[PDB]
Amino acid sequence: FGSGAIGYEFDNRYLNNQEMSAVAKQRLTSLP
Amino acid sequence: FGSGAIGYEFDNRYLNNQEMSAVAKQRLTSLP
Amino acid sequence: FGSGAIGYEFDNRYLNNQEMSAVAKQRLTSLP
Amino acid sequence: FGSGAIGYEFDNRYLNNQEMSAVAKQRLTSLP
Amino acid sequence: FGSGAIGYEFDNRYLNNQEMSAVAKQRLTSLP
Amino acid sequence: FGSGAIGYEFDNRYLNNQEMSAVAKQRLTSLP
Amino acid sequence: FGSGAIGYEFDNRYLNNQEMSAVAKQRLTSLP
Amino acid sequence: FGSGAIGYEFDNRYLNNQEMSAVAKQRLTSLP
Amino acid sequence: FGSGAIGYEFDNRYLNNQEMSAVAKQRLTSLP
Amino acid sequence: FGSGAIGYEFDNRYLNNQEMSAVAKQRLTSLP
Amino acid sequence: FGSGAIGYEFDNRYLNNQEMSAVAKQRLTSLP
Amino acid sequence: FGSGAIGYEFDNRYLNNQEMSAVAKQRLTSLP
Amino acid sequence: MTYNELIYMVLDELKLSSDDSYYTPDHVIFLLVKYRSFLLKQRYSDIKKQIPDSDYQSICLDLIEVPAISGEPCEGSSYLRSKNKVPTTMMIGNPRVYPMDFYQGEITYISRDRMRYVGYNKFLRNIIYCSKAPDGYLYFKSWNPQFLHLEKVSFNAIFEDAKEASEMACPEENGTICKLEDKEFPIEDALVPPLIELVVKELRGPEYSPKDEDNNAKDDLPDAR
Amino acid sequence: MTYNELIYMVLDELKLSSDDSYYTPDHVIFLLVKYRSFLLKQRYSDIKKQIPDSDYQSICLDLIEVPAISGEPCEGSSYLRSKNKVPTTMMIGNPRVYPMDFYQGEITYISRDRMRYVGYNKFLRNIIYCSKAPDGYLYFKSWNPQFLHLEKVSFNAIFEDAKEASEMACPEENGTICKLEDKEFPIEDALVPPLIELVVKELRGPEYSPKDEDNNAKDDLPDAR
Amino acid sequence: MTYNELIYMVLDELKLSSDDSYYTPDHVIFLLVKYRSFLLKQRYSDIKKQIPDSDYQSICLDLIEVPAISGEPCEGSSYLRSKNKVPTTMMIGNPRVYPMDFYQGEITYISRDRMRYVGYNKFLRNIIYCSKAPDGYLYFKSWNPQFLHLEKVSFNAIFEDAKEASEMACPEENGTICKLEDKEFPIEDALVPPLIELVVKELRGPEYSPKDEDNNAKDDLPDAR
Amino acid sequence: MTYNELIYMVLDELKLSSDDSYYTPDHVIFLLVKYRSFLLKQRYSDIKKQIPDSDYQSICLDLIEVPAISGEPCEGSSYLRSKNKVPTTMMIGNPRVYPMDFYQGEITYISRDRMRYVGYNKFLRNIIYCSKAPDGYLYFKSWNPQFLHLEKVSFNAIFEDAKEASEMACPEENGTICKLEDKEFPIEDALVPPLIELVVKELRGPEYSPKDEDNNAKDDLPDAR
């Protein structure tokens, strides 16, 4: 059948947690 | 058939534990 | 057929052990 | 067919070894 | 059937988060 | 058909080696 | 059926992000 | 059909090599 | 059916990015 | 059909290379 | 059907890149 | 059908590259 | 819940309503007692958790002075022991032998291997010890001659066989319970759905499995009779 | 549970009700004793756990003074040994030879390889040692001539064959038990569901497998007769 | 268990009841002896574990003085050797040659490569050595002329072929056992379910495989006759 | 086991009972000798393990003095060599040439490449060396003229072809064995189930594969005749 309001929010939340991991590897380094 | 109150709470809890891992990699670094 | 009291407790215990790994990566860091 | 006293104890033992790995990452850190 | 405006934006967002991980490994090193 | 005395001992030995890996990560740490 | 202008650009973008990871491991080392 | 004297010795040897990896992570640590 | 000018260039580009990762691990070491 | 003199020697060689990796992690440590 | 001059060269190139990774882990160490 | 002179040499070359990785982890350590 | 409610759930989950059925309540009583100690050992033996009060049973014991070996003088001091055999405890909870008041007394249930070396400490000589010898009986021991006057103790533990500990149960305020089925089944109510699932799974397959129907001096099971 | 309850569960799980059936209770007695020591070695041999009291059996022994080799003077000192052969113990628990009181005596069951070198210590010369020689008998040894007066010991261990140790069982208070089936089966009640599952799985497939039905001087098994 | 109980379990697991069947107890005796040493080498050869007493057999030997090569004076000192050939031991346990008392004597079973260089130490010259030469015989060696008076030794080890070591078995208290089938099969009872599974798996497929049924001067196996 | 028991297990595993069958015992003798050295090289060539005594065979050799090249004076010193060709040894065990006593003598089997440079050391000039030249013969060499009096040696090694080393076998105490099938097959009993599995797997598929049945001057295999 079909209804995609919980498939959407779980997929949108998995890409959020994957994006959250990617921005936690960002470093503005502090050697010369 | 269908009933999704335990598929929801287990999927909502897996995205919670994945989010919990992503916020545990966050570091406000402390070199100049 | 169907009976889900051992599928539930094993899935609830796998999300517990996954949550337990996520809270073991948490560090309140101690440099300035 | 069906009999689940060895599927249970092997699944209960896999979640035990997964829990054992999660508690071996726990550290009460010892810097200020 | 077919409709691809949510398959597109989720695939476009997964390649964004994969690109975000790749640019977070870039280092302009600072030894001689 | 069925006979499970070699499926048991190989599954019991895989959970043993997985348990053996989990107890080899245990550390009683020795900083203050 | 067939149309491959979004399968192409997503595959071309995945190989781009994989190439981007490979050039971020390149180091011109600076010991003697 | 069936004959399991080479399936046994290859499975017994894979659990041996997995056990060999587990005992190579064991450390009797030597700080106070 | 068949046409392989985009399967070729994507496979040729994946082996290029895999080769690019392999040459980025090469180190002419600089201790005595 | 069946003939297993090249399936045997490739499986025997994969368990050899897996055993070779396990004995390369063995360390007789040299702190007190 | 069959033609294997592009399956060969892609498989020969994947084993080349896997061999290239293996020779990049080789170290003639330089402590006493 | 069957012909195995290119399946053999690719499998023999994959076990060679896996063996090559295993001998590159071998270290004759040089502390007391 | 009692024993009856747990039997009749597994019977009704299997729809074993007919009197002319292959699997009786005795097949269910056996499997519920076996899967109780199976499931309690799966939960409470790896790492240490709180055990609820539901998994314990208190049994009542009559103690009699028995010799060490026989009626000889140089064999050693005599013991007290239960006149009837005691169930085997599981090693997951707090076993406790007490003189008919749980909040009083120091009678220490220990290992059988330990009880041959007890009471050599000068400060631990008025303490009565308990273990279950390989005779199947609970033996008592102290260096104090006063311990040979105990006539009665109660034993609260998580015994392995729940049916054995229900026939040795303590008398109620009203009186003894004649039928095992009107007695309390000793498991926490949070472990009853996993208990019913495993007993139903064991008997569900065999419930529909064929029988040797014909009396013809021949095994008719390969023919799925 | 007894031997009978474990036999008749596996028979009823397989629905082996008919007297004209291929697999008898002797097929089940054999497989329950084999899968008991299989399962106890799977649980209790890798890393060391507490073994419950249920897995042990106590057997009674009569000891007789036997020579070292023969009736010659220069062969060495004589031993005591059991008049009947003893079962082989498993190396997972606490084997214990005791002089009819478990809480008393120092008789040490050891390796057979060790017992040829024992008692050279001046402080360990009044201690009686036990091992099972390749004769199948339990031998006794000490440097103390007093040990040659033992007439009887009991042996509590987890023996490999549970049927052998049930025929050498100690007499009860009531008396000896004539039938093996009314004797206690020696396994913890938490290991009975994995024990019944493996014995049923071994005989379930062969239960429905065809037989050579026809008497025609020919093997009819490739035809699935 | 004996040899008979292990044969008749594999026969009954395969349902090989008929006298006109293709696979006899000799196919089963062969495969049980081959899968015994296969399975003991799989368990006990990688890293060192305790071997149970069940896997060993004690055989009895008569020793005779034989020359080194022939009746010449300058060849070297003579040996003792078994008059009959000895089984080949496995390298997993504690092989032990002993002078009819297991708890006594220092007769050292060693490698054949080692025994050509033994006894050059001044403190190791009264020790008798054993090895199995490529002749198939057990040879004896020491620098002490007294060793040439041994008439009899017993050899306890885990031999490779369990059938060879059962025909050389030591006499019982009652007497010799005429049939191999009433003799004890030498494997731990925890290794009997994996042993029966592999012997049944090897013969189960071939049990239902077709035969060349017709006598017509032609191979009828491609037609699945 | 002998050669016969290993042939007739693979024949009976394949059910090759008929005399009018395509695959004879010579197909089985060939494949058992080929899969013996295949399997011994798979186990014992990567890292060094103990080889059992079962994999070796001792063959007997007659040695004759042969020239270096021909009957010329300036060619070099003469050798001893076996009058018949010797089997090729595998490089996995301890090959050993010995003067009819395994526990005596220093005759060193070495590489053929090494034996052209041996004995230049002043302390290694009384030692006899062995190698197998590309002629197929075993040659002997030392700087000591005494070595040219050897008439007989025995050669214990793990030869590549087990059938070649069984026809050169040493005489027994009883006498020579006429048939190869009553001689001992040289493999450890722990390697016999993997040996029988591979020889049965090679011939099982071809056992049921079609033949060119019709004599019609035409290949009938594409039609699966």
Nearest to M55 by CA among M182, M141, M156: M156
- Whether the CB-CB separation of N6 and N196 falls below 8 Å is answered with yes
H/E element holding P108? strand P107-109
Strands N79-82, N57-66: pairing kind: antiparallel
Distance (Å, rounded) from C-alpha F22 to C-alpha D20?
A: 6
β-partners of residue O58 are O156
β-partners of residue O138 are O132
Tokens encoding P87: 């089997």
The answer to whether chain A touches chain B by having 3 or more C-beta pairs less than 8 angstroms apart is: yes
Distance (Å, rounded) from C-alpha E26 to C-alpha P215?
A: 76
I24/G26 touch (CB, cutoff 8 Å), yes or no: yes
From M42, M47, M205, residue closest to D2, measured CB to CB: M205
- Whether the CB-CB separation of N10 and N196 falls below 8 Å is answered with yes
H/E element holding L18? helix L7-22
Tokens encoding M19: 């009197």
- Integer CA distances (angstroms), M191 to C14, D2, M39, M48, M129, in order: 18, 20, 8, 17, 33
Output the 3-class SS for chain I.
Answer: CCCCCCHHHHHHHHHHHHHHHHCCCCCCCCCC
In chain F, the residue whose alpha carbon lies closest to the alpha carbon of N38 is F5
G20/E15 touch (CB, cutoff 8 Å), yes or no: no
L20/K15 touch (CB, cutoff 8 Å), yes or no: no
CA M87 to chain CA centroid, nearest Å: 5
State the Rg of chain C over Cα: 16
From I8, I12, I22, residue closest to K21, measured CB to CB: I22
> Going by C-beta distance under 8 Å and a sequence separation of 6 or more, which residues neighbour residue J30?
L29, L31, L32
Give the 3-state secondary structure of residue C31. Answer: coil
N220 CA: distance to closest CA in chain D (Å): 29
Distance (Å, rounded) from C-alpha O81 to C-alpha O63?
A: 5
In chain D, the residue whose alpha carbon lies closest to the alpha carbon of N204 is D1
Residue whose structure tokens are 């009797």: H28
Mutate to test the interface with I, among K3, K9, K13, K30 (most CBs of I within 10 A): K13
Give the 3-state secondary structure of residue B11. Answer: helix
Neighbors of chain B with 3 or more C-beta pairs under 8 Å: A, C
Residue whose structure tokens are 């292959």: M22
Distance (Å, rounded) from C-alpha N208 to C-alpha M210?
A: 10
Distance (Å, rounded) from C-alpha F8 to C-alpha E25?
A: 46
User: O24: number of CA atoms within 13 Å, CB side?
Assistant: 7
Give backbone dihedrals phi and psi of M219, rounded to 5 degrees, phi first: -85, 120
> Going by C-beta distance under 8 Å and a sequence separation of 6 or more, which residues neighbour residue P171?
P60
Q: In chain N, what residues touch D1 (CB-CB under 8 Å)?
A: 204
B30/C31 touch (CB, cutoff 8 Å), yes or no: yes
Q: In chain J, what residues touch L29 (CB-CB under 8 Å)?
A: 27, 30
Tokens encoding P204: 């099982």
For chain M, give the residues followed by a break (C–N over 2.5 Å): none
Angle formed by the axes of helices C7-22 and D7-22, nearest 10°: 10
Rounded to 5°, angle at Cα M103 from M100 and M108: 75
Tokens encoding B8: 């929801």
G19/I17 touch (CB, cutoff 8 Å), yes or no: yes
Mutate to test the interface with P, among H1, H6, H10 (most CBs of P within 10 A): H6
H15/F20 touch (CB, cutoff 8 Å), yes or no: no
Tokens encoding M27: 């097949």
Give backbone dihedrals phi and psi of O165, rounded to 5 degrees, phi first: -80, -10
L20/K19 touch (CB, cutoff 8 Å), yes or no: yes
Nearest to M97 by CA among M86, M85, M105, M88: M105
Neighbors of chain K with 3 or more C-beta pairs under 8 Å: I, L
Distance (Å, rounded) from C-alpha K17 to C-alpha P127?
A: 52
Give backbone dihedrals phi and psi of D16, rounded to 5 degrees, phi first: -70, -45
The full DSSP string for P10-25 is: HHHHTT---TT-SS-H
Distance (Å, rounded) from C-alpha P212 to C-alpha P199?
A: 24
Distance (Å, rounded) from C-alpha P139 to C-alpha P109?
A: 10
User: K15: number of CA atoms within 13 Å, CB side?
Assistant: 18
State the Rg of chain A over Cα: 16
Q: In chain O, what residues touch N68 (CB-CB under 8 Å)?
A: 101, 103-104
- Whether the CB-CB separation of P88 and P141 falls below 8 Å is answered with no
- Whether the CB-CB separation of B12 and A17 falls below 8 Å is answered with no
K5 CA: distance to closest CA in chain L (Å): 12
Distance (Å, rounded) from C-alpha O128 to C-alpha O140?
A: 7
**End-to-end Cα separation, chain C, in angstroms:** 60
From H6, H17, H27, residue closest to J19, measured CB to CB: H17
The answer to whether chain C touches chain P by having 3 or more C-beta pairs less than 8 angstroms apart is: no
Neighbors of chain O with 3 or more C-beta pairs under 8 Å: F, H, N, P
N104 burial level (CB within 10 Å; 0-12, 13-18, 19+): middle
Q: Residue K16 corresponds to which amino acid?
A: N
Q: How many helices (H) and strands (E) does chain B have?
A: 1, 0
Residue whose structure tokens are 């071998």: L26
Residue whose structure tokens are 């379930």: N204
Neighbors of chain A with 3 or more C-beta pairs under 8 Å: B, E
N38/F4 touch (CB, cutoff 8 Å), yes or no: no
From C12, C25, C31, residue closest to B24, measured CB to CB: C25
A20/B23 touch (CB, cutoff 8 Å), yes or no: yes
Rounded to 5°, angle at Cα P67 from P66 and P70: 130
In chain B, the residue whose alpha carbon lies closest to the alpha carbon of A17 is B19
- Whether the CB-CB separation of P202 and J7 falls below 8 Å is answered with no
CA P168 to chain CA centroid, nearest Å: 9
Give backbone dihedrals phi and psi of L14, rounded to 5 degrees, phi first: -75, -35
Give backbone dihedrals phi and psi of P108, rounded to 5 degrees, phi first: -105, 115
Nearest to N80 by CA among N144, N123, N125: N144
β-partners of residue P97 are P107, P155
Mutate to test the interface with I, among G3, G6, G19, G20 (most CBs of I within 10 A): G19
Q: In chain K, what residues touch I8 (CB-CB under 8 Å)?
A: 6
- Integer CA distances (angstroms), C19 to B6, C8, D19, J21, M161, in order: 18, 16, 10, 32, 36
Mutate to test the interface with M, among N23, N53, N109 (most CBs of M within 10 A): N53
Give the 3-state secondary structure of residue P77. Answer: coil
Strands P96-98, O96-98: pairing kind: unpaired
Tokens encoding O8: 């008749």
Sign of torsion over alpha carbons O148, O152, O158, O163: positive
Residues in chain D, total: 32
Distance (Å, rounded) from C-alpha O67 to C-alpha O71?
A: 7
- Whether the CB-CB separation of N23 and N206 falls below 8 Å is answered with yes
Strands O128-132, O107-109: pairing kind: parallel
> Going by C-beta distance under 8 Å and a sequence separation of 6 or more, which residues neighbour residue O159?
O57, O59, O87, O88, O89, O90, O165
> Going by C-beta distance under 8 Å and a sequence separation of 6 or more, which residues neighbour residue M169?
M57, M58, M59, M60, M176, M177, M183
> Going by C-beta distance under 8 Å and a sequence separation of 6 or more, which residues neighbour residue P122?
none
From L6, L10, L24, residue closest to K25, measured CB to CB: L24
Angle formed by the axes of helices K7-22 and L7-22, nearest 10°: 10
Tokens encoding P13: 């595993």
Q: In chain C, what residues touch M198 (CB-CB under 8 Å)?
A: 6
Q: In chain E, what residues touch G6 (CB-CB under 8 Å)?
A: 4, 8
- Integer CA distances (angstroms), O43 to G29, N2, O57, in order: 50, 33, 18
Nearest to N31 by CA among N14, N48, N45: N14
- Whether the CB-CB separation of P194 and P39 falls below 8 Å is answered with yes
Neighbors of chain G with 3 or more C-beta pairs under 8 Å: E, I
O52/N216 touch (CB, cutoff 8 Å), yes or no: no
H26/F24 touch (CB, cutoff 8 Å), yes or no: yes
Which residues 1-32 of K have a C-beta within 8 angstroms of I?
Answer: 6, 10, 13-14, 16-17, 20-21, 24-25, 27, 30
F15/D13 touch (CB, cutoff 8 Å), yes or no: yes
Q: How many helices (H) and strands (E) does chain E have?
A: 1, 0
The answer to whether chain P touches chain H by having 3 or more C-beta pairs less than 8 angstroms apart is: yes
L24/K19 touch (CB, cutoff 8 Å), yes or no: no
H15/F17 touch (CB, cutoff 8 Å), yes or no: yes
Q: Residue P69 corresponds to which amino acid?
A: I
β-partners of residue N152 are N62
Give the 3-state secondary structure of residue K31. Answer: coil
H30/J25 touch (CB, cutoff 8 Å), yes or no: no
A19/E14 touch (CB, cutoff 8 Å), yes or no: no
Q: Residue P20 corresponds to which amino acid?
A: D
Give backbone dihedrals phi and psi of P64, rounded to 5 degrees, phi first: -130, 145
Mutate to test the interface with P, among H1, H3, H8, H9 (most CBs of P within 10 A): H3
Tokens encoding P22: 């395509």
The answer to whether chain P touches chain J by having 3 or more C-beta pairs less than 8 angstroms apart is: yes
Tell me the residue ranges of DSSP E strands in chain L: none
Neighbours of N222 (CB within 10 A): 17
Q: Residue P2 corresponds to which amino acid?
A: T
Distance (Å, rounded) from C-alpha O91 to C-alpha O110?
A: 11
Distance (Å, rounded) from C-alpha O159 to C-alpha O56?
A: 7
From O47, O201, O209, residue closest to H4, measured CB to CB: O201
Nearest to O182 by CA among O192, O193, O191, O174: O174
Give the 3-state secondary structure of residue H17. Answer: helix
Nearest to M167 by CA among M55, M107, M84, M99: M84
Tokens encoding N201: 């799985």
- Whether the CB-CB separation of M220 and M214 falls below 8 Å is answered with yes
